[PDB]
Design an enzyme around this catalytic site. Structure first.
Site, PDB file in Angstrom:
ATOM      1  N   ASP A 166      38.782  36.082  46.850  1.00  0.00           N
ATOM      2  CA  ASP A 166      39.518  36.724  47.930  1.00  0.00           C
ATOM      3  C   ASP A 166      38.604  37.491  48.881  1.00  0.00           C
ATOM      4  O   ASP A 166      38.721  37.352  50.110  1.00  0.00           O
ATOM      5  CB  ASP A 166      40.587  37.651  47.369  1.00  0.00           C
ATOM      6  CG  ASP A 166      41.927  37.447  48.048  1.00  0.00           C
ATOM      7  OD1 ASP A 166      42.906  38.158  47.702  1.00  0.00           O
ATOM      8  OD2 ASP A 166      41.993  36.559  48.933  1.00  0.00           O
ATOM      9  N   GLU A 405      40.242  34.706  36.879  1.00  0.00           N
ATOM     10  CA  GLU A 405      41.161  33.614  37.172  1.00  0.00           C
ATOM     11  C   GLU A 405      40.476  32.247  37.141  1.00  0.00           C
ATOM     12  O   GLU A 405      40.567  31.483  38.112  1.00  0.00           O
ATOM     13  CB  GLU A 405      41.826  33.857  38.524  1.00  0.00           C
ATOM     14  CG  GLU A 405      42.686  35.102  38.552  1.00  0.00           C
ATOM     15  CD  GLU A 405      43.687  35.116  39.711  1.00  0.00           C
ATOM     16  OE1 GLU A 405      43.566  34.258  40.620  1.00  0.00           O
ATOM     17  OE2 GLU A 405      44.602  35.980  39.707  1.00  0.00           O
ATOM     18  N   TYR A 461      52.109  37.878  39.316  1.00  0.00           N
ATOM     19  CA  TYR A 461      52.620  38.343  40.599  1.00  0.00           C
ATOM     20  C   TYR A 461      54.058  37.918  40.904  1.00  0.00           C
ATOM     21  O   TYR A 461      54.350  37.550  42.051  1.00  0.00           O
ATOM     22  CB  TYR A 461      51.714  37.851  41.723  1.00  0.00           C
ATOM     23  CG  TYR A 461      50.373  38.542  41.842  1.00  0.00           C
ATOM     24  CD1 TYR A 461      50.274  39.821  42.375  1.00  0.00           C
ATOM     25  CD2 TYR A 461      49.200  37.893  41.469  1.00  0.00           C
ATOM     26  CE1 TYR A 461      49.058  40.442  42.520  1.00  0.00           C
ATOM     27  CE2 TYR A 461      47.963  38.507  41.613  1.00  0.00           C
ATOM     28  CZ  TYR A 461      47.898  39.782  42.139  1.00  0.00           C
ATOM     29  OH  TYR A 461      46.677  40.409  42.280  1.00  0.00           O
ATOM     30  N   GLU A 499      46.471  42.493  36.931  1.00  0.00           N
ATOM     31  CA  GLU A 499      46.842  42.404  38.335  1.00  0.00           C
ATOM     32  C   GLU A 499      48.342  42.217  38.455  1.00  0.00           C
ATOM     33  O   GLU A 499      48.959  41.536  37.638  1.00  0.00           O
ATOM     34  CB  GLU A 499      46.114  41.268  39.053  1.00  0.00           C
ATOM     35  CG  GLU A 499      44.607  41.395  38.984  1.00  0.00           C
ATOM     36  CD  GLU A 499      43.904  40.372  39.844  1.00  0.00           C
ATOM     37  OE1 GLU A 499      44.588  39.799  40.730  1.00  0.00           O
ATOM     38  OE2 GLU A 499      42.684  40.137  39.622  1.00  0.00           O
TER      39      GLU A 499
END
Ligand SMILES: [Cl-]
Lengths: 592, 590
Positions: A166, A405, A461, A499
């Protein structure tokens, strides 16, 4: 194969002067820097502060996005009293790739832009005179180097990066540069483990040196009072009535290492602060000093408006001011080793860190299939070795994260995990837990690597990437459905959420809420809290992110990532007060 | 006694003590009776350099006023026994007492200029030593900058300044541990003359011994172009590369002590620019050609460091000022870190160097028993400033007040005295001036004979004739400009504050005050006025970036008159000057 990553100290045997300040700086698109003599040094470029990411100092986009070779230049004085000592330039980070020239002569290269490395310049300089250091740094990403990514070429010729991660590709001399003079025979490394008995403790140490001279080890408390001493490179310091180091309650003893017998002046001295504490995983418990704990926190980057990815002591001290206020006691150094000064402050402030190596991007949106795995792996294991060597003695390091990840669904990921985990099982003398984050696509049903990590780190998420908005109710039920499956299979290791959250534009309000508003951030966090509290094996919550941070431009990135509890300026969104209330009501031994 | 910036060579060392010190508030004033001068470790960690205010979550700390304490351990190398040892504090805001190993060494008044403590006999060579600093940040009418300290009904002390910026306090600039020779350079001076393609550097060198002196100048490639012996002398540079606005060239000066036979006793090196500054009637001449000033309008203010110098913000502020076409700025309202001037020297900017003589007026002032001590500290800080920044090619003029209350006839004795006691301090004899507030005008000001050129602060369209009235405010400004022109103005005029608070993101058509459009409208108005008068030789807009301020109902989280946000992104008014200033040549109006 870095011979030593000890942090510079100053005493009568060791000197350390910083070369931070303004350097000369030039881009090299053509790659003709060396053909035309830039390595002897230059002053016809632009001034560039060090340490600092070079990207945001330019008004033109092509320079912000530059990808290729770039050069830093500087002059520095070498004192004549240094002749005969072991002389080093220590670079605390050059992102991502560096060749070091001193006075025109090439000294070494280095791969990986997040760990330190030193250049022996003993023979490359004139003593008692001005010398020149030039750095040829490189910037590009490939799937054979950490962080994973690609480099593409616009139709007009300019190179640019397409990362697999990111964060923004902030580059350059991101951390301090030291000039060191050390003894010829010196300390290179040491190691500490701890044991507790009643009100007493034992430090077990080892010391590596480049020679055969004797080693004395001495342990002093907070006020300078010596409490244990031992002789030799292995040993055991008996500390009666020890003052244990405690979460959000640090106590640090000064450790002193010296070389020589009592006919000599000490040939070398090294000094470091350590905390007496033990870390065990037991069942689903994380035990600090043999009592269970519950992790609360973030979720961080090293990102600031003016330094980019460079270390700034002011921003770091405010992050800790905020994190103490809000009730946190832990954070993960995502997604790369942080400046060493950060772990010293976690030791001083009693925080629990998850130290992460920069292995993001092992995930194409077929990764483990390909042929870049051979070279990638060398750099990965090497970056894991150097990370564990650098930070192993910090009381605040709790666990090592070895991926972020990665694509754990690919069955070809299992040979790679087996290798990485085998090769690292003994690097850390304290033998703390080793883990990684499981991405959202990587569940108890789809992952193939669930047997490896010592505890589980989930990135979930619901409410943002899936089941957003009014569907949030379905997202909570689907997360509860996953957590039901873990419970059925009977998790025997602890689970930590690392997260979750919600992009939030500060100042954006709506009633009722809509995604991106401050109110929606809170509703999402309250929802996660309700899940966490309903499962006994969930042993911590680390929200993403602490602050807003910069990112590659994109239509889903409202100038950077905006998932922060605080803004990039380090002021609180409404969610900060939510956690300020929840976390200071949860005790340390929550769930027990 | 010496304010030379530290350098590193074989005679002089310089090591920063920056990092995490220990910190404690002393609201009671018991610190010394409690033994804190011997050092402590039971407080909170605090970065150095940096203002301490913004690191606390409680307002009581952020606003704390009184005695505060910094403590640190440091190592004194054995090799340093025999040299002159110094702790150099680059800035301690506003008052300091220095202790080493519990022994009181020195005090200092003034929070924006460096001072050094000789610690040669207070340390244990070869071991750890302690340094403790007892700072105070109270304000009064006897210290610069001027203000008052009040007590609230609940006992707590609180500052109420006579100036706009926030009371950022603490160790705002680096701390150096120096090793100097026993006989050493203390000071030097430079002045310049031009003749054809040749120039003459005229130097002098202050020393604390009688050993011989040897000065040499080298060009940017390291070639030596002039040598001279003696504490006074003149270097002849053939075919000199002049230092030009936005086009610097810097020669390296090297001072060396000792005769041709002995080991060198001291080396000192600095970088100078060969250029001259003359006020010729109504022109500002750099190298005998007329210039036109365009710029800001600045503060040393950043989100995380506060008042403290941060090199990242400084290079970013400079990247922006070149992008925008500017060539000048005024160090409002206090001397800046010394790095600011070295960057200015390398980038060919013209600086107005300002002493913290701000707040000399109330909402009278020169009619109080505080002037006597105030003036002591005022002319002393003037002396220290000029002594520190003399040799920078980029310092164009000295500013001795910001917005003093010059309406009262009692300001006139004090100006008379300040201007006589500074008359012969700058060897280059650059122009001394000050800013005139909105109330101090051609009609009303009583000190208009003193300055060498006029610096005007005017706020039509903001503090007067806001909104739809702006047209009457433009007319009033031209009124005053007509009366200057009538009065036959012979010195130059430079506008040094003007503008409008602007909340980035506020848009309206038509505009309202606080929107991005109104700011552009206001700046266009001022431009129209500036362009119809020839004595007007410069526009320095207020302000470069949004900076922090005392809380008040007119302060929307600090000042907002900045062309850029506090994070240094542009507002629409950034692009107006980027267009305008990159089209005005350096000799506009000549
Ligand atoms: Cl040599």
């Amino acid at each position: 194969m870095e011979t030593s990553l000890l942090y510079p100290v100053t005493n009568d045997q060791r000197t350390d002067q910083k070369l931070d300040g303004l350097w000369q700086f030039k881009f090299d698109e053509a790659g003709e820097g060396e053909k035309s003599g830039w390595e002897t040094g230059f002053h016809d470029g632009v001034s560039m502060p060090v340490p600092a990411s070079f990207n945001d100092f330019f008004t033109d986009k092509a320079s912000r996005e530059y990808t290729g070779d770039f050069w830093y230049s500087r002059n520095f004085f070498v004192p004549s009293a240094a002749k005969g000592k072991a002389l080093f330039l220590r670079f605390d980070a050059v992102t991502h790739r560096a060749t070091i020239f001193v006075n025109g002569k090439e000294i070494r290269t280095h791969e990986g832009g997040f760990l330190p490395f030193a250049a022996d310049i003993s023979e490359a300089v004139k003593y008692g005179a001005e010398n020149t250091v030039v750095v040829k740094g490189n910037n590009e990403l490939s799937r054979e180097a950490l962080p994973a990514g690609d480099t593409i070429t616009l139709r007009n010729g300019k190179k640019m990066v397409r990362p697999f991660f990111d964060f923004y590709n902030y580059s350059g001399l991101n951390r301090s540069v030291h000039l060191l003079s050390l003894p010829q025979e010196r300390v290179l490394d040491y190691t500490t483990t701890f044991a507790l008995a009643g009100n007493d403790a034992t430090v077990n140490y080892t010391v590596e040196t480049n020679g055969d001279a004797p080693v004395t080890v001495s342990l002093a408390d907070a006020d300078g009072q010596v409490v244990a001493t031992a002789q030799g490179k292995q040993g055991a310091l008996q500390v009666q009535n020890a003052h244990l180091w405690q979460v959000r309650n640090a106590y640090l003893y000064t450790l002193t290492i010296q070389l020589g017998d009592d006919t000599q002046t000490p040939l070398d001295t090294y000094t470091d602060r350590i905390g007496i504490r033990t870390i065990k995983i037991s069942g689903t418990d994380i035990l600090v000093n043999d009592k269970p704990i519950y992790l609360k926190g973030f979720g961080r980057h090293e990102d600031s408006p003016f330094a980019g990815r460079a270390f700034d002591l002011n921003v770091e001290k405010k992050d800790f001011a905020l994190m103490k206020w809000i009730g946190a006691n832990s954070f993960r150094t995502s997604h790369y080793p942080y400046d060493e000064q950060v772990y010293k402050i976690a030791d001083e402030e009693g925080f629990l860190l998850t130290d992460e190596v920069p292995a993001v991007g092992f995930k194409m949106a077929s990764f483990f299939k390909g042929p870049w795995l051979k070279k990638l792996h060398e750099r990965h294991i090497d970056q894991i070795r150097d990370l564990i060597k650098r930070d192993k003695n910090h009381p605040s390091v709790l666990a090592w994260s070895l991926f972020n990840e990665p694509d754990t669904i690919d069955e070809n990921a299992v040979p790679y995990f087996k290798q990485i985990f085998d090769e690292s099982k003994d690097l850390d003398p304290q033998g703390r837990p080793r883990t990684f984050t499981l991405s959202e696509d990587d569940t108890i049903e789809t992952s193939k690597v669930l047997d490896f990590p010592d505890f589980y780190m989930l990135n979930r998420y619901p409410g943002w990437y899936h089941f957003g908005g009014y569907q949030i109710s379905d997202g909570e039920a689907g997360l509860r459905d996953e957590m039901d499956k873990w419970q059925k299979a009977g998790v025997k290791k602890p689970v930590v959420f690392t997260e979750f959250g919600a992009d939030t534009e500060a100042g954006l309000h709506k009633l009722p809420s809509v995604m991106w508003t401050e109110e929606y951030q809170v509703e999402v966090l309250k929802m996660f809290s309700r899940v966490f509290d309903d499962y006994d094996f969930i042993k911590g919550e680390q929200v993403w992110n602490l602050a807003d941070f910069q990112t590659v431009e994109g239509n889903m990135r409202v100038n950077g990532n905006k998932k922060g509890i605080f803004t990039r300026d380090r002021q609180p969104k409404a969610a900060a007060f939510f956690y300020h209330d929840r976390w200071n009501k949860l005790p340390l031994d929550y769930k027990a």
